[PDB]
Amino acid sequence: KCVNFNFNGLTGTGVLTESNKKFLPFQQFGRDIADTTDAVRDPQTLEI
């Protein structure tokens, strides 16, 4: 759904969908080649 999402590091509005990407335990979020954040990890539970 289209929502305003903030997890601990940033503000933004978009559609959140769980994917098969794998983050390292110390990796919080990630960005694309455009330096825009395309993914974020749940600060509470473990979800990508």
Binding site: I33, A34, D35, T36
Partner: protein, 48 residues
């Protein structure tokens, strides 16, 4: 007949072996890629 049919075969071999002959069109994609990426990256700059 042997001159034309062999010449077309050389074009198929040249395009398959050498991928830089199409760089004229690859530049158009590169000019668009560099233009689109730069316009997005300027959003992160502070501009003073």
């Amino acid at each position: 007949a042997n001159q034309f049919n062999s010449a077309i075969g050389k074009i198929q071999d040249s395009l398959s072996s050498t991928a830089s002959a199409l760089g004229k069109l690859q530049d158009v994609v590169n000019q668009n890629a560099q233009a689109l990426n730069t316009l997005v990256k300027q959003l992160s700059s502070n501009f003073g």
